[model samples]
Target: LTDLKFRLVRESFADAVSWVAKNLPTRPAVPVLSGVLLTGSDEGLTISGFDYEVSAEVRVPAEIASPGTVLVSGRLLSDITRALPNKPVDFYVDGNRVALTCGNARFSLPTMAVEDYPTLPTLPEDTGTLPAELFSEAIGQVAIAAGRDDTLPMLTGIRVEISGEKVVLAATDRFRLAVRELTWNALSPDIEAAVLVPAKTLGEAAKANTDGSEVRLSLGAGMGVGKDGLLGISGDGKRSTTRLLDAEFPKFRQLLPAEHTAVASADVAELTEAIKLVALVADRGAQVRMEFADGMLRLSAGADDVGRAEEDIAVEFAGQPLTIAFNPTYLIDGLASLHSERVSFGFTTPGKPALLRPASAEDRIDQGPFAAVPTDYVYLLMPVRLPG
Candidate 1:
């Protein structure tokens, strides 16, 4: 039998505790699910939390006096560490409780039965690696379009299509679909697969790769909860595993509009501000009307009780002048997700869907015999039906 004890840097301990704690379910089906498992060894300290469907863990450097294992309330531990002073954090098991001390602050947290905790799942073999910033950014861009309705499990996931060096991330809420393409170094030149991942879990877990380090992407056969298998992201001493959604993701490629009757370009910041201003008067449905003509774009909205509002911004336009209406929230979300300073909109008609893409300020809008502009990312939005 081993004794539970360890001493670690306060900052490192605090970070590990918080990261694992955030993944634990607030209302756990089993009491032990609310606790974090702490294992101390010659290597260092390992902090972990698992909610069956998702698992998160991190390793931090520590001096183990008696290498052992213990379990404590993860939420309480996270709270205490975040407010502790800048000093060494000493922890050890004292009978039935864990004694934690940092500087002058002392916490005697009750220990849970470590035997009752479930085993954390191991990650699959490394599939590929990508830049940290890109991995996280791509997730954020597509996650915004994922459906929030729990009843539709398929739409709540982000479809991950991996074709050798190229990877595509796509999400849709029926009304709007966001697709982002990125390339990563793959372990094999011909490996190809597609899977659906829970968007809520991925969006938060992507934080693991935000520190400019490379992130290893893992997939394939593993001890997974579903037949579809598991997905993992690990890097910089942190790792997380999540079960893939078993539901089938919609075929998104065929949904893209092939041609456009008009294309309009405007400064993203300016258009966002203009939409926010005019949308103040928009009613519950919140539709903002846009009219594009020679060198100018007009924005207008109206509500039942409130007054109407209108604004205009000079914009680059090509093809037939057109008027279209869109839900302001969806339109702004697509615009904000783009990385460029300017946005280009491809429109076939006021009654059809529209496409928004990142564009350079000087990129000219192509006219007649036109095709949708090719871009690495695209946000497709369905237009609101006009009353006229």
Candidate 2:
């Protein structure tokens, strides 16, 4: 097979190779899994890599001299392309090795057995397309709560629920749960489905493909292939698919309390700064005590071996005066996730979990249910159980 030849801009080639290489398996089960397959065709050059669970592919514009396919180490190609000079890069098959030339730089790379490489999966079917920024921001909001432990596979995924035009994303690490609801363009008005995607894959794909106007998502069943547990994300000439996590996600909706005993709203930046400062004295996993009263929110932390710290912030409070404790890191994460200038917390009791949401400067906090509260996004934090 000696018909492979193409020319492409160095920057574009480098970017495509780096993106594909980043998704390669760190500890490949097979040596071929560590390679990136390059297919040169009349339309362009397609670079792709797969490691069974996840596959990434990108089509870069190129001047094709001939059509052919070659396999090479993904990481090696990534480094070579990135270090190439700022000029048009040419590729050609020479016997058993591929030659790369850009400006005065030239190098030879040994090609692997292309027959041993697995075929990248095709994009199922176009489920629908949504604004890339919207999808990326939504993923960022909820992915923070995904569990890192692999043993609890269910908790390590981001649960996606699609109902017509409305989409809901939820994730939890047992200690905290983040839920975000957004609407997207739908292929069918009555379509209702759900899937669980690994948090890491979804997050990276969302960020990488956001340069385009919209990202197309394909899932469930599609033509040509009856791939049931697959997710396809493609945009900006980059596309990827990962096998969906086949696990039963928790019933996250039931965990949200319908009512709250007290509610507090404060400046997010102010509270975040105070927490960071006071947390200095907090022991590992120590709870940060929050005391709330009329127009004041006090944050305090301490350890027997260290000193104590206390800070106060002006806040608008409603309902009975209450004190609560939370893990400082969790509290900060919940606050940082909110985009608004102010943060609101709805608490039922000291030991119970709290619901955090974005708040406006004019928003007022009152006792009864806060039923009119916006449900688009909510972060739930379970209070740390303090020692008696």
Candidate 3:
């Protein structure tokens, strides 16, 4: 029987397919990768695309007047589906091509045989569920710390560690490290897993939320030699699989200072904005010197060619005067991710890492070694030693 129907459901399938196309593989030399496979069933319709390394699947509800499957180039299908006239559009399968007609517009596109598409791994019986909202927030808070450095693949993905009832996400680029933690009910007792997931995939997954649907997470078999890792996340009638980085993430926890000889507190927004403006003149490798002495914190940045700029603000400090140089971008990132009104700074020495967290003792994420921060978020920056 011929499969397809006119626009009984106009916006549903088109919108979902359009989003998946934006992320579809542009370099599909492999026949199956170049097109989206469409399957019409009694229940609804499903559209899927994949490049093997990353895949997106979206399902749209439809009234099936006929049942069949066809594969069409993802790019062309997206364009046609979006530009169709306001009125209902006719769709039907004819031999190896699918025909579409809207008002005076009519076109026929060749379709690939659906039997050749690669199969995606099915979720294991032991797969787990997580609060999509909380997981999305955690990714938003710390994914930036994962460097965009192409030389180090592991650093480009966030390291996700699940132990007992707590979930910890950490990312680092050697120069800076950020960690965010969240708590959830555990499905399996004493379960623990460590996986590095690509930042781009997680970012898109976070933005895919609609109706606040929950997310399902499944671990894939480890990567082959020299290949990246893998994890699968599905939700909101959509699914995505991403390759994780395989390199070893640094021992980020040990990077934090054991003792802080000097500590200070300042308004997060005010300091972040001031430092951003001053950073305009800061040299590529130079840092913004933060001198905490008496009752003020002074921020300064610039090179010999560019005139220096400094802003001083009152702060709460009771220890000896201290000065440390840090990449202004690190400080700005930390402050921007913080949800607190004020931030606390902890330091051991000028050449050592500086720790930043919410100033309120009640705001920290109380899991793992992070319980010491008294907040759910903690950011650490390794300073750039200023020349004497």
Candidate 4:
């Protein structure tokens, strides 16, 4: 409020702002939640944003003519900094106003008390680490099954179960369920813990921060809200702490099949695209009809009441011919998430649930089958009941 000034390289300032910008909510519960706090001193410059549930911060090097902290609307500050020419950024705060200047761009902005945007509590982080790239892909695979509707908060969470060297991410929206398991470097290989996190936050964080590096993740009983706990992820100079969902995920392991009478493998490159176009025929709903037989699979959507579309793809199938209906959106979602060349499916019967996974588990009479569902990632799609 009295006197504060700092000068920093544009790139450094932009990097810091980019890291914390994600924490700003379009519609915040409180005004302070949307504000960014910049602190400059011998320790370097710190830019921070917090939205109650999740807190993000980044640090950069800055020449401190005066050492102090000032706050401004996070969105506005980021915009000014990001748009500034490739030059140094200067913030001169005097009498509660900051005369911000950089490369011919100058604006006087009102500053707020540093106390308004409270500092984040120090969070512990000894849980474990995982490959940044792997973590991002795993979250993408499983979180797609998480529900988008907040009314049923439980379904919108991804159950993160960590044990020893294993980490499992699972999510379901009743109609479908997805599970992705991977090995993570662990502090305690025997550690058994589970926390349900908001799928949107955790997924986005992992994908965005984990680029050719490692992310340290920590799980702790949340002391802030009545929520389940907190999931902290840190990578390089960026970090985020998110409040977990206080919801009980179902016993999802049982939802996957131990065995299936029929198993099919198809080129994912062929299946997903077909589903997308054929699903368009529905004109109303996204349901698509499937008929599978030896060496063949046919997909059809729409009816005389609307329009009709049909297509067929070659498949490697075993067991009896089966006909089933599936929501094409879900079918396409699972297949599209896969990066593998092929996709596999297991079905007990047409009237039962079907499982989709990265192709190549078919063979042998066991879960050991070459064309069996992948243990790393599986999508269990519920078939739409057809009219008898």
Give the number of the best model, judged by lDDT: 1
Question: CA shift at 187, candidate 3, in angstroms?
Answer: 2.2
Q: Per-residue lDDT of 43-104 in model 1, one digit per residue for the tens?
A: 59999999998998889989989888899999999999889998998999987899999888
Cα lDDT tens digits for candidate 4, 1-388: 3366889898888778867876688787677777888777884887888878888877777888887778887788878888889998888787777888998889898887677676684556467888888998999999999999999998999998876789898999998899988998886566767878999998888767867888888764334222335778887777678887888999998888887788888888788888887888785666888889868999898878878999999988877778889888888888877778888788886777898878544432232233444568889999987755
Which candidate would rank higher by lDDT, 1 or 4? 1
Q: Write the per-residue lDDT of candidate 2 for residues 1-388, one digit (tens) a residue.
A: 4569999899999999999999897688888999999998876999999998889999989999989999998999999999989999999988789999999999899999899999888777878789999999899999999999999999999999888889999999999999999999887666677889999888888866677488888884333222467889878888899888888899998989887878889999999999999998988748788999988999999966788899988998887888889999999999988888999888887877899999888876445555427668899999977657
List lDDT for all candidates, in order. 0.88, 0.87, 0.74, 0.80
Task: Give TM per candidate.
Answer: 0.96, 0.95, 0.87, 0.91
**Tens-digit lDDT string for candidate 3 (291-329):** 888779888889779778889887777467888888887
What is the alpha-carbon lDDT of model 3 when measured against the actual structure?
A: 0.74
Clashes of 1: 0
Ranking by lDDT: 1, 2, 4, 3
Q: Model 1: which ten-residue window has the lowest total lDDT?
A: 220-229
User: Stretches of candidate 4 above 4 Å error?
Assistant: 1-3, 220-228, 360-374
What value does the lDDT take at residue 30 in candidate 3? 76
Clashing pairs in 3: 229-244, 363-375, 364-374, 364-375, 364-376, 365-375, 365-376
Clashing pairs in model 4, backbone N/Cα/C closer than 3 A: 164-189, 361-370, 361-371, 361-372, 362-370, 362-371, 362-372
